[PDB]
Write a protein that binds this ligand. Structure first.
Ligand SMILES: CCc1ccccc1CC(=O)N1CCC[C@H](C(N)=O)C1
Ligand SMILES: [Zn+2]
Length: 139
């Protein structure tokens, strides 16, 4: 579990969105596993606007942060789950690092701010849904 709080927006993994997130829907994209909802209180997370390929992510299944080198956002095949059929997930970045079911929503950050959130994983890998291209989050 986990979310990004920036301005009047809450960014979560689309498959973990609540009834409240859907009732205050701003934008969602199944192909990216992202959903953004509106908030009443101001959020103070800063979004990175960069092309960093190194950062640090929070791994809830270890209660620890880990440094990672990650690939540029791309279209990656993701096996079927209870949430989605087998499909290509876009704007996904892979890294070597621990992740297990339950870790989605952990924040990935570089020196510039929030890069994305955990969205996939498996066999010593972790995948992050990029949010750096969503320029409207800051307005
Ligand atoms: C960190 C998650 C994980 C780690 C290690 C093994 C398995 C998983 C679960 C997994 O990758 N998925 C289930 C939930 C929806 C995800 C999606 N974005 O399509 C895919
Ligand atoms: Zn950066």
């Amino acid at each position: 579990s986990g979310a990004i709080y920036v301005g009047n927006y809450r960014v979560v993994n689309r498959h973990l969105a609540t009834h409240n997130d859907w009732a205050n829907l701003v934008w969602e994209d199944s192909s990216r596993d992202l959903l953004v909802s509106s908030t009443t209180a101001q959020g103070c997370d800063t979004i990175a606007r960069c092309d960093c390929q190194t950062g640090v992510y929070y791994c809830s299944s270890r209660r620890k942060h880990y440094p990672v080198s990650f690939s540029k956002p791309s279209l990656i095949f993701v096996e079927a789950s209870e949430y989605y059929p087998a499909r290509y997930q876009s704007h996904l970045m892979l890294a070597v690092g621990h992740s297990e079911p339950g870790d989605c929503g952990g924040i990935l950050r570089c020196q510039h701010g929030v890069v994305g959130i955990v969205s996939t994983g498996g066999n010593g890998l972790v995948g992050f849904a990029d949010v750096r291209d969503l320029l409207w989050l800051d307005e």
